[PDB]
Design a protein around this nucleic acid. Structure first.
Ligand SMILES: [Mg+2]
Ligand SMILES: [Mg+2]
Ligand SMILES: [Mg+2]
Ligand SMILES: [Mg+2]
Ligand SMILES: [Mg+2]
Ligand SMILES: [Mg+2]
Ligand SMILES: [Mg+2]
Ligand SMILES: [Mg+2]
Ligand SMILES: [Mg+2]
Ligand SMILES: [Mg+2]
Ligand SMILES: [Mg+2]
Ligand SMILES: [Mg+2]
Ligand SMILES: [Mg+2]
Ligand SMILES: [Mg+2]
Ligand SMILES: [Mg+2]
Ligand SMILES: [Mg+2]
Ligand SMILES: [Mg+2]
Ligand SMILES: [Mg+2]
Ligand SMILES: [Mg+2]
Ligand SMILES: [Mg+2]
Ligand SMILES: [Mg+2]
Ligand SMILES: [Mg+2]
Ligand SMILES: [Mg+2]
Ligand SMILES: [Mg+2]
Ligand SMILES: [Mg+2]
Ligand SMILES: [Mg+2]
Ligand SMILES: [Mg+2]
Ligand SMILES: [Mg+2]
Ligand SMILES: [Mg+2]
Ligand SMILES: [Mg+2]
Ligand SMILES: [Mg+2]
Ligand SMILES: [Mg+2]
Ligand SMILES: [Mg+2]
Ligand SMILES: [Mg+2]
Ligand SMILES: [Mg+2]
Ligand SMILES: [Mg+2]
Ligand SMILES: [Mg+2]
Ligand SMILES: [Mg+2]
Ligand SMILES: [Mg+2]
Ligand SMILES: [Mg+2]
Ligand SMILES: [Mg+2]
Ligand SMILES: [Mg+2]
Ligand SMILES: [Mg+2]
Ligand SMILES: [Mg+2]
Ligand SMILES: [Mg+2]
Ligand SMILES: [Mg+2]
Ligand SMILES: [Mg+2]
Ligand SMILES: [Mg+2]
Ligand SMILES: [Mg+2]
Ligand SMILES: [Mg+2]
Ligand SMILES: [Mg+2]
Ligand SMILES: [Mg+2]
Ligand SMILES: [Mg+2]
Ligand SMILES: [Mg+2]
Ligand SMILES: [Mg+2]
Ligand SMILES: [Mg+2]
Ligand SMILES: [Mg+2]
Ligand SMILES: [Mg+2]
Ligand SMILES: [Mg+2]
Ligand SMILES: [Mg+2]
Ligand SMILES: [Mg+2]
Ligand SMILES: [Mg+2]
Ligand SMILES: [Mg+2]
Ligand SMILES: [Mg+2]
Ligand SMILES: [Mg+2]
Ligand SMILES: [Mg+2]
Ligand SMILES: [Mg+2]
Ligand SMILES: [Mg+2]
Ligand SMILES: [Mg+2]
Ligand SMILES: [Mg+2]
Ligand SMILES: [Mg+2]
Ligand SMILES: [Mg+2]
Ligand SMILES: [Mg+2]
Ligand SMILES: [Mg+2]
Ligand SMILES: [Mg+2]
Ligand SMILES: [Mg+2]
Ligand SMILES: [Mg+2]
Ligand SMILES: [Mg+2]
Ligand SMILES: [Mg+2]
Ligand SMILES: [Mg+2]
Ligand SMILES: [Mg+2]
Ligand SMILES: [Mg+2]
Ligand SMILES: [Mg+2]
Ligand SMILES: [Mg+2]
Ligand SMILES: [Mg+2]
Ligand SMILES: [Mg+2]
Ligand SMILES: [Mg+2]
Ligand SMILES: [Mg+2]
Ligand SMILES: [Mg+2]
Ligand SMILES: [Mg+2]
Ligand SMILES: [Mg+2]
Ligand SMILES: [Mg+2]
Ligand SMILES: [Mg+2]
Ligand SMILES: [Mg+2]
Ligand SMILES: [Mg+2]
Ligand SMILES: [Mg+2]
Ligand SMILES: [Mg+2]
Ligand SMILES: [Mg+2]
Ligand SMILES: [Zn+2]
Ligand SMILES: [Zn+2]
Lengths: 53, 69, 110, 77, 141, 181
RNA sequence: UCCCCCGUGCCCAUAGCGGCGUGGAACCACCCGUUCCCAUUCCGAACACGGAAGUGAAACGCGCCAGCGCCGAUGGUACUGGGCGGGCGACCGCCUGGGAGAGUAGGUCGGUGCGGGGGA
RNA sequence: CGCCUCCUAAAAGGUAACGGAGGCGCCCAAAGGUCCCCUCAGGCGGGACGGAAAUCCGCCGGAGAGCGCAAGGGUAGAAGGGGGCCUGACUGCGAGGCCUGCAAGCCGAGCAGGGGCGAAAGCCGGGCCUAGUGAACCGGUGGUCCCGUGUGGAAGGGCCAU
RNA sequence: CUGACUGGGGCCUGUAGAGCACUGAUAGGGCUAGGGGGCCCACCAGCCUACCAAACCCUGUCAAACUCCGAAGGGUCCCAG
């Protein structure tokens, strides 16, 4: 991690809970991450979005 | 072949300046060229185009014999 | 110095053996198509099926499917149900795919 | 006068943890190593750090297949 | 004088001097030889002194073959420092020499000349030596 | 397959003359053309106007086949070369297309070379293949002055089943490749 | 049960490189095609399909040859577990048990299982 | 001054010195998963601009190349190179072990939930591996809706995540 | 009865020694790019070298951080005393 390589949380888009922490490079990957993840709240995979740590 | 990336090959006539005509294939049906194997010097036996000289120089000057012995 | 063929062949066979199943191996010549179901623990073939041995006919694909069903038949009769498909150096497609679908209809489990 | 040297890293305790003939249980670590000095053989898994371990309860066996490398097997009991 | 043009490492641990020569035990180029009777680190300077004396005996003529080479770096702490604070600096290079080694050979020169040169050269070496001449045993190795 | 004159010339005139000249005991032993591989080593497109879609077009007209791009194996300083950079084209002519190309190369292109005094007798492999380099692409009947932005040459490999230079010469010469000496 | 070939394994070069020879009935390949399935960062080269006129040229299979490669004793030695001596030292020896590496002689142009197909 | 790699280290493990040499305090949205395909450096020969080295063709070439970075081990029967689809860079756990004074560190089959790739066998709980790190205390933020000082709330806390 | 130690058996190892196949070092010779120098030139190629010398080869060596090899021993488990 660095000023450019940041930590971020992934929020389930259906129930709004942050379910995963991970990291990315914001120079290489400026758009907010969107990833399908398993939401344990929703009990199903859900598109999760990068939301600020 | 893969579709949509390759120019078609069709029967094509290449016409040279000698008046030669070639039955071949191309991406263009009719082509006119200024030279070919039928009329090119190097090809045409050894057609010594413009310079059939035999050097001509320089022993071969000969003007003349009029200096005396 | 191996060839793309020798490599491809190893690479898929290696993965298949790793899983420990009986292996349905497939040879595909210009004309025919053969099938051994092999036990690699013992180094042994347990059931065979060939277009050569079945003196089978014409369209290679249709033929494949036939050896396919043929193999499964002698196979279930020996108690063999499950098995792993060894596409050898061959893309799973064409005659091989056809052979595979045939051993499937035939009741082979994979 | 002084030294630009002076450091070293912790030992990693690598190597075989169970030798041929030894009775193991499912999960037992058999080999600890860097890269594939021994390859997983019959009933032997390999973890992400090349660690070899028993897949079943059984007995360890080593096998040297020449150019194919060396192999750790576990033979069921 | 003799030293490596390059090395992977600047300093070498000291090691030991047990045993007879590993090889280098038979005459292999010239006619007469100088063999080490006892082990030592032979210094580059000592080697060069041995050589020079031999060419000096020959004046003009002969061939000298040098069969030992100083690739071992010799280290020493600066004067008067105390123990610790790192390893000494390289001060020279030695060639490790265990008993039996043919260190030098000469060829193309009379016997009385090869004898005397190797004797004088011997006096420059910090070990006991014997002069040998090529036998069949040399030729059979 | 197409009836193309040079192809036929091979089977009719060259085939037999060769069997005469070297006395083959086998139909397959006699020299065949295998492939003609044309390459534009380019890299005049490294950065600049790395639109050599222009050249890929030109080659596609000449050979009737769309070249594929080549890119640098390693990064190189003095040529200004970062690894992965598009520096060349390569179109691999086989079969009918190979013949059609060679036909026009021999009949029309080589004639149109400036001060053409014959192909090089020494450009032979030693395993019996031939290579030859062009300076311009205006040589081909398909590419007019009007349509070209800048002069670019190419490398032509002609690959034979011959085992020896000496045999491969006969094949290409008989097909009509003009050699200077 | 023997011979040839096609698959697939095992031993892991005594199996390899090279030179020579040989095989197409069968099988295998190359081969003929590129409509069709499928395919080329271009290419029916590959992969893939449909084929059966040809050829064993390539590949492959099987033989033969020791130039290279690989294998390699016996003998002796180095070294050494244990036990003893000597030397001021660098170091050196004896006993008992183990015993290389190099090298020499020599060996090798593979051996073998399973299933198919063909032959006697 | 912590951490990694090699040597010292006496062929298990471990092993010191202000002994001999080098690295780390990152990174990668692909440089991750899976399916499919591909194979190197280098040498000789041949080929316009074009050179020791750009790209192309031929032969030889088992790995000396590659693998983000030090070293080592590993590795083409791929861990290397290319492409397609993807987010397992899972959630709930976890048999059994490695290591080990503690606390840490490490590996992990399997079952369940919901997925990815694959025809399938199957693989996938980040990365060929070993560095890329920091206990507890105090506090922040999202969630939960567990406690709530007579009672209902609220304040404040707990719990899960960071 | 499981111990130290010992007997037998399997597996693990990279040291002593040795080697040079790898990484490097290395004397000499051979062969041969490359330079230096001398003939002969600037018309661009030649030729000669008891000079320095790459790669390769032969002879002969060196290495804690080299290993194609490689012990004696050591470790561990099983049976037994
Ligand atoms: Mg996480
Ligand atoms: Mg310092
Ligand atoms: Mg240190
Ligand atoms: Mg430690
Ligand atoms: Mg330590
Ligand atoms: Mg360490
Ligand atoms: Mg071990
Ligand atoms: Mg794993
Ligand atoms: Mg990994
Ligand atoms: Mg065994
Ligand atoms: Mg077993
Ligand atoms: Mg010391
Ligand atoms: Mg001294
Ligand atoms: Mg010292
Ligand atoms: Mg000191
Ligand atoms: Mg010192
Ligand atoms: Mg000194
Ligand atoms: Mg010595
Ligand atoms: Mg003296
Ligand atoms: Mg010797
Ligand atoms: Mg030539
Ligand atoms: Mg050829
Ligand atoms: Mg034109
Ligand atoms: Mg076979
Ligand atoms: Mg067999
Ligand atoms: Mg077997
Ligand atoms: Mg024949
Ligand atoms: Mg043959
Ligand atoms: Mg036939
Ligand atoms: Mg016939
Ligand atoms: Mg046909
Ligand atoms: Mg079509
Ligand atoms: Mg149709
Ligand atoms: Mg084809
Ligand atoms: Mg043949
Ligand atoms: Mg084949
Ligand atoms: Mg013989
Ligand atoms: Mg030997
Ligand atoms: Mg012996
Ligand atoms: Mg003894
Ligand atoms: Mg002792
Ligand atoms: Mg003894
Ligand atoms: Mg030994
Ligand atoms: Mg021996
Ligand atoms: Mg052989
Ligand atoms: Mg059989
Ligand atoms: Mg039979
Ligand atoms: Mg730290
Ligand atoms: Mg150690
Ligand atoms: Mg060690
Ligand atoms: Mg150790
Ligand atoms: Mg030890
Ligand atoms: Mg331990
Ligand atoms: Mg530092
Ligand atoms: Mg990609
Ligand atoms: Mg990867
Ligand atoms: Mg991918
Ligand atoms: Mg190359
Ligand atoms: Mg070249
Ligand atoms: Mg040029
Ligand atoms: Mg070039
Ligand atoms: Mg490497
Ligand atoms: Mg670095
Ligand atoms: Mg999808
Ligand atoms: Mg536990
Ligand atoms: Mg613990
Ligand atoms: Mg699944
Ligand atoms: Mg599941
Ligand atoms: Mg599916
Ligand atoms: Mg798992
Ligand atoms: Mg990686
Ligand atoms: Mg990492
Ligand atoms: Mg406190
Ligand atoms: Mg405190
Ligand atoms: Mg708190
Ligand atoms: Mg209240
Ligand atoms: Mg409440
Ligand atoms: Mg109150
Ligand atoms: Mg109220
Ligand atoms: Mg209430
Ligand atoms: Mg409220
Ligand atoms: Mg609250
Ligand atoms: Mg709360
Ligand atoms: Mg918590
Ligand atoms: Mg939780
Ligand atoms: Mg007892
Ligand atoms: Mg016990
Ligand atoms: Mg005990
Ligand atoms: Mg014992
Ligand atoms: Mg030693
Ligand atoms: Mg060496
Ligand atoms: Mg040798
Ligand atoms: Mg030593
Ligand atoms: Mg060491
Ligand atoms: Mg060593
Ligand atoms: Mg023991
Ligand atoms: Mg033991
Ligand atoms: Mg007992
Ligand atoms: Zn949710
Ligand atoms: Zn004309």
């Amino acid at each position: 991690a660095s000023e450019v390589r940041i930590k971020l949380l992934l929020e389930c888009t259906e129930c709004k809970r942050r379910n995963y922490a991970t990291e990315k490079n914001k120079r290489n990957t400026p758009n907010k991450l969107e990833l399908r993840k398993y939401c344990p709240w929703c009990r199903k995979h859900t598109v999760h979005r990068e939301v600020k740590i | 072949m893969k579709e949509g990336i390759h120019p078609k090959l069709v029967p094509a006539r290449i016409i040279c300046g000698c008046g030669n005509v070639i039955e071949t294939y191309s991406t263009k049906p009719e082509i006119y060229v200024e030279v070919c194997s039928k009329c090119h010097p190097f090809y045409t036996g050894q057609q010594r185009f413009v310079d059939t000289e035999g050097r001509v120089e320089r022993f071969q000057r000969r003007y003349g014999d009029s200096y005396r012995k | 110095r191996l060839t793309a063929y020798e490599r491809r062949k190893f690479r898929v066979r290696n993965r298949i053996k790793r899983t420990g199943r009986l292996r349905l191996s497939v040879f595909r010549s210009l004309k025919h198509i053969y099938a051994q179901i092999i036990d690699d623990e013992k180094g042994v073939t347990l059931v065979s099926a060939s277009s050569l041995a079945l003196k089978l006919k014409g369209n290679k694909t249709e033929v494949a499917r036939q050896v396919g069903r043929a193999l499964a038949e002698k196979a279930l009769a020996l108690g063999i149900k499950q098995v792993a498909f060894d596409r050898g150096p061959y893309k799973y497609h064409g005659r091989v795919k056809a052979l595979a679908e045939g051993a499937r209809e035939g009741g082979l489990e994979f | 006068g002084s030294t630009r040297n002076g450091r070293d890293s912790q030992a990693k305790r690598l190597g075989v943890k169970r030798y041929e003939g030894q009775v193991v249980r499912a999960g037992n670590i058999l080999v600890r190593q860097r890269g594939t000095r021994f390859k997983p053989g019959k009933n032997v898994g390999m973890g992400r750090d090349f660690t070899l371990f028993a897949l079943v309860d059984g007995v360890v066996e080593f096998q040297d297949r020449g150019r194919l490398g060396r192999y750790v097997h576990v033979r069921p009991l | 004088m003799l030293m490596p043009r390059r090395m992977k490492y600047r300093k070498q641990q000291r090691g030991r001097l047990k045993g007879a020569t590993k090889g280098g035990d038979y005459v292999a180029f010239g006619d007469y030889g100088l063999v080490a009777l006892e082990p030592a680190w032979i210094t580059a300077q000592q080697i060069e002194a041995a050589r020079v004396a031999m060419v000096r005996h020959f004046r003009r003529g002969g061939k000298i073959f040098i069969r030992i080479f100083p690739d071992k770096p010799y280290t020493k702490k600066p004067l008067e420092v105390r123990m610790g604070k790192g390893k000494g600096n390289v001060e020279g290079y030695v060639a490790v020499v265990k008993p039996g080694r043919v260190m030098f050979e000469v060829a193309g020169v009379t016997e009385e000349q090869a004898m005397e040169a190797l004797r004088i050269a011997g006096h420059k070496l910090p070990i006991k030596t014997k002069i040998v001449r090529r036998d069949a045993y040399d030729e059979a190795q | 397959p197409l009836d193309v004159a040079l192809k036929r010339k091979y089977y009719e005139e060259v085939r037999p003359e060769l069997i005469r000249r070297f006395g083959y005991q086998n139909v397959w032993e006699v020299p065949r053309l295998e492939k003609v591989v044309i390459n534009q080593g380019l890299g005049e497109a490294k950065e600049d106007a790395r639109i050599l879609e222009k050249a890929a077009q030109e080659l596609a007209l000449i050979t009737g086949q769309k070249p594929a791009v080549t890119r640098a194996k390693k990064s190189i300083s003095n040529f200004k070369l970062r690894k992965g950079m598009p520096i060349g084209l390569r179109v691999t002519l086989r079969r009918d297309r190979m013949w059609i190309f060679l036909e026009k190369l021999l009949n029309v292109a080589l004639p149109r070379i400036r001060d053409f005094r014959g192909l090089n007798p020494n450009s032979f492999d030693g395993r019996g293949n031939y290579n030859l380099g062009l300076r311009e692409q205006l040589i081909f009947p398909e590419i007019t002055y009007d349509m070209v932005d800048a002069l670019r040459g190419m490398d032509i490999a002609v690959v034979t089943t011959a085992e020896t230079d000496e045999e491969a010469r006969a094949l290409l010469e008989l097909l009509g490749f003009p050699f200077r000496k």
